Amino acid sequence: PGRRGSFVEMVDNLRGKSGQGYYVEMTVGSPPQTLNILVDTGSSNFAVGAAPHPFLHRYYQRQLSSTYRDLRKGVYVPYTQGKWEGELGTDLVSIPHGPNVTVRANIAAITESDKFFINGSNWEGILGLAYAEIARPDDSLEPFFDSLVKQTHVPNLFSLQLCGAGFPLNQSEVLASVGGSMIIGGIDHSLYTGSLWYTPIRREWYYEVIIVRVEINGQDLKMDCKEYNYDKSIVDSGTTNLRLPKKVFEAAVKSIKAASSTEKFPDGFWLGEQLVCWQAGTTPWNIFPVISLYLMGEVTNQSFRITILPQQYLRPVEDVATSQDDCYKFAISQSSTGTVMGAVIMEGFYVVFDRARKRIGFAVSACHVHDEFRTAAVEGPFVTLDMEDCGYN
Numbered sequence: 001p002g003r004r005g006s007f008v009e010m011v012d013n014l015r016g017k018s019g020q021g022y023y024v025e026m027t028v029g030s031p032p033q034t035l036n037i038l039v040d041t042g043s044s045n046f047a048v049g050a051a052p053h054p055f056l057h058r059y060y061q062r063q064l065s066s067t068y069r070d071l072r073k074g075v076y077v078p079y080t081q082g083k084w085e086g087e088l089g090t091d092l093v094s095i096p097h098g099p100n101v102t103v104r105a106n107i108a109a110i111t112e113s114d115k116f117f118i119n120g121s122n123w124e125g126i127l128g129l130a131y132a133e134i135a136r137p138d139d140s141l142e143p144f145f146d147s148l149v150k151q152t153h154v155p156n157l158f159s160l161q162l163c164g165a166g167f168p169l170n171q172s173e174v175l176a177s178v179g180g181s182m183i184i185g186g187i188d189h190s191l192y193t194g195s196l197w198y199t200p201i202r203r204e205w206y207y208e209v210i211i212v213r214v215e216i217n218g219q220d221l222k223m224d225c226k227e228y229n230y231d232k233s234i235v236d237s238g239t240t241n242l243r244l245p246k247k248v249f250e251a252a253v254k255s256i257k258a259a260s261s262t263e264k265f266p267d268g269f270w271l272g273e274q275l276v277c278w279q280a281g282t283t284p285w286n287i288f289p290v291i292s293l294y295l296m297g298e299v300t301n302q303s304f305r306i307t308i309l310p311q312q313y314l315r316p317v318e319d320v321a322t323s324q325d326d327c328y329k330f331a332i333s334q335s336s337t338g339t340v341m342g343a344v345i346m347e348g349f350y351v352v353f354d355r356a357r358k359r360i361g362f363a364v365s366a367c368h369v370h371d372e373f374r375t376a377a378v379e380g381p382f383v384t385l386d387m388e389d390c391g392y393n
């Protein structure tokens with residue numbers, strides 16, 4: 001049965017890449033002010049540059065919006081490395097390649113920042129799609145998506161198809177290239193192959209999930225499953241890498257090194273800091289293992305697995321000489337804040353944030369990078385016992 005794509009107006013509305021983020025075009029204010037906004041499932045504030053910055057070519061000008069409302073309150077958001085200081089307000093917001101609706105939403109006008117804006121990313125703001133619990137200053141600041149659902153007939157769901165190119169893109173290349181899709185209010189069936197498998201959203205704060213088993217080329221990492229979710233496991237479009245808890249990262253890297261041992265790489269490569277290059281077209285994908293993350297299913301005692309390739313966890317980067325070599329960074333790194341299923345993982349799949357049914361769907365992406373021998377996979381069911389015990393308290 002042929003799968004039909006019913007959300008053509010929202011298909012291909014994203015641009016960007018895993019390293020600098022995926023963004024969607026939005027307008028704020030009256031008359032509309034066009035801004036490129038980073039799509040972030042790992043935070044809950046909608047904020048835009050609202051003052052000059054060396055990395056900003058445009059920003060929100062509140063004095064030019066007739067519909068701007070001042071909330072007379074400051075707001076501060078600290079991320080993993082970046083942070084910003086802003087002024088709260090509300091204004092009319094639209095997504096030109098989104099639903100044909102305009103909503104009044106909370107907007108944090110960024111006045112000061114540190115390592116937030118990325119030089120040449122082409123985005124000027126952030127769209128925090130997660131829940132009110134993690135919004136700053138507190139959970140009374142209604143996130144954008146909650147406003148959107150409350151004010152319109154848009155269903156309480158969005159889905160993301162993040163499309164990694166498999167090769168580097170310069171600033172002009174990301175501007176001219178399609179980066180993927182953000183389908184607001186539905187599931188577009190042309191964006192995936194095979195079946196959608198659903199994992200429950202453990203708690204509505206981050207998009208929190210439970211990992212029950214981890215495999216490197218079919219080999220069980222054999223850790224107590226609590227370790228995989230210590231202190232939580234989240235699906236995060238706003239983080240580049242697959243980030244793993246310290247103990248899990250150390251076990252995974254030992255296994256990935258063992259599986260790829262026909263070639264030796266410097267410590268800086270495994271630390272995710274140093275690039276590794278191969279002659280054009282000769283990347284030895286086959287020496288690197290596949291990685292399987294088993295997720296709690298919706299049916300009691302049932303799990304399913306998502307499998308990524310090195311085409312996902314090896315992030316394409318440009319060489320210092322901009323040569324013809326194919327270069328990459330190891331996009332798996334240590335975390336002190338739980339598992340982070342970042343953009344490099346999401347690039348393998350069509351990810352459904354079904355807020356209505358408190359679940360996250362995964363299916364093989366129609367735009368995942370692969371080779372003629374292996375593809376990413378979403379498979380199940382597996383009989384897995386005491387999966388609730390994997391959750392950390």
Ligand SMILES: CC(=O)N[C@@H](Cc1cc(F)cc(F)c1)[C@H](O)[C@H]1CO[C@@H](OCC2CCCCC2)CN1
Nearest residue numbers: 021042043079080081082083115116134236238239
């Ligand atoms: C890389 C990165 O920081 N990605 C960010 C988004 C983000 C992207 C970016 F390109 C620059 C930046 F400064 C921030 C993402 O939100 C991460 C942030 O860390 C974790 O969330 C912490 C949470 C605490 C309460 C306030 C909201 C954030 C997990 N999610």
